[PDB]
């Protein structure tokens, strides 16, 4: 029942700052250390530092001194990491993860990650277009076109449909905008009797679209 719930994805301009949250539930945050780690696309994981949530002491990787500040709000069971003076080198997915307060730093429970994109480009929400099935398995999907920054989420039928789903990595177009597709294969017999709706969320632009994909 232990969960670490991180704040959502963020677009930030170079030179700005961002404060990422990590809310603990199912345990008391003060009983364990909290760690923060960074993963940049095509690089190795890096440990930023830790914080003792009970009394507030911190250890930083020297590479992140002056870049990251770790705090905790005990009253709300929430750990925070502020990233300052942002540059494109800070674009990454950041996780919080707990480990023992007085012992080893094996990180046994991780947050879901927070994507930060540092860019001067403006946010743009996607258009969502059906990939309609046509002429005993059928394929159908949704095209999630022209958004910035990453990420988006796609589910099918509010999460009730998972088997046979493939949501592809986004591609970056020359316009500077991403596009991705999500497809599913289903029994051809179901096309006239089962509803298929893709649920698309692009949090940075506050875009939520449900699109029915009709045969």
């Amino acid at each position: 029942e232990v969960q670490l719930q991180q704040s959502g994805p963020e677009l930030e301009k170079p030179g700005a700052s961002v404060k990422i949250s990590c809310k603990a539930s199912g345990y008391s945050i003060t009983d364990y250390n909290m760690n923060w780690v960074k993963l940049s696309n095509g690089k190795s994981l890096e440990w930023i530092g830790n914080i003792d949530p009970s009394h507030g002491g911190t250890t930083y990787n020297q590479k992140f001194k002056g870049k990251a500040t770790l705090t905790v709000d005990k009253s709300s069971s929430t750990a925070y990491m502020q990233l300052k003076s942002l540059t494109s080198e800070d674009s990454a997915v950041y996780h919080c993860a707990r480990s023992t307060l007085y012992g080893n730093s094996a990180m046994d429970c991780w947050g879901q990650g927070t994507s930060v994109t540092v860019s001067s480009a403006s946010t743009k929400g996607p258009s969502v277009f059906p990939l309609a099935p046509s002429s005993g398995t059928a394929a159908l999907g949704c095209l999630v076109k022209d958004y910035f920054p990453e990420p988006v989420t796609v589910s099918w039928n509010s999460g009730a449909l998972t088997s046979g789903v493939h949501t592809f990595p986004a591609v970056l177009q020359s316009s500077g905008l991403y596009s991705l597709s999500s497809v599913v294969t289903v029994p051809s017999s179901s096309l006239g009797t089962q509803t298929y709706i893709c649920n698309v969320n692009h949090k940075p632009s506050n875009t939520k679209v449900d699109k029915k994909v009709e045969p």
Partner: protein, 212 residues
């Protein structure tokens, strides 16, 4: 900082095979080594701590060993769901540092793609652009050639593709390619075709439609 050198960078084995991954620390780190598994689209999960102890709930096919500088992580019988990046971590002293990971890939038998083509939606056409999508579904191995043709003319520079990570259940890949045209150009041509070459096919497969 302490460097963790992880080898091999990639493993390709069929289900049922054993594998051993190695992490070499640049100085002694005693038993302060942890191993994590990161499956596609998920956060890392703890598997082994203090070099050789399985975390609660971890299947018994996973073990680790070592003390000093040479550490290993072993899967006695690789399963399809074990597709993941595995990485080591030292916490002997700060900063914690990680190996660069080993991507465990599943070898399975050749499987030809099922190929599907999707015209642009009328909804998109109202907006001035036309995207044509070709899907290659559930194939193996990953290498595949997709060629777009419009009225039999080979296209270049106006498509993009991406490929999923291996499926955790059947070990296949899928590939999506999008041909992007202006609406005006789309409405000047009739036959839209995607031609697929793959080692599971005895000759290329073409899926096409006639606009309208």
């Amino acid at each position: 900082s302490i460097v963790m050198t992880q080898t091999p960078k990639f493993l390709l084995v069929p289900a049922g095979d054993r594998v051993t991954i190695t992490c070499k620390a640049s100085q002694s780190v005693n038993n302060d080594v942890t191993w994590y598994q990161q499956k596609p689209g998920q956060s890392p999960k703890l598997l082994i701590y203090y070099a050789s102890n399985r975390y609660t709930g971890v299947p018994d096919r996973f073990t680790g060993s070592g003390y000093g500088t040479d550490f290993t992580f072993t899967i006695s019988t690789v399963q399809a769901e074990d597709l993941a990046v595995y990485f080591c971590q030292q916490d002997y002293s700060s900063p914690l540092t990680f190996g660069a990971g080993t991507k465990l890939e599943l070898k399975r038998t050749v499987a030809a793609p099922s190929v599907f083509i999707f015209p642009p939606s009328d909804e998109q056409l109202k907006s001035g652009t036309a995207s044509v999508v070709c899907l290659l579904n559930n194939f193996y191995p990953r290498e595949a050639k997709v060629q777009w043709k419009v009225d039999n003319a080979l296209q270049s520079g106006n498509s993009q593709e991406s490929v999923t990570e291996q499926d955790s259940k059947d070990s296949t890949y899928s590939l999506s390619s999008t041909l992007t045209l202006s609406k005006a150009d789309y409405e000047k041509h009739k036959v839209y075709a995607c031609e697929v070459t793959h080692q599971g096919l005895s000759s290329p497969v073409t899926k096409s439609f006639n606009r309208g």
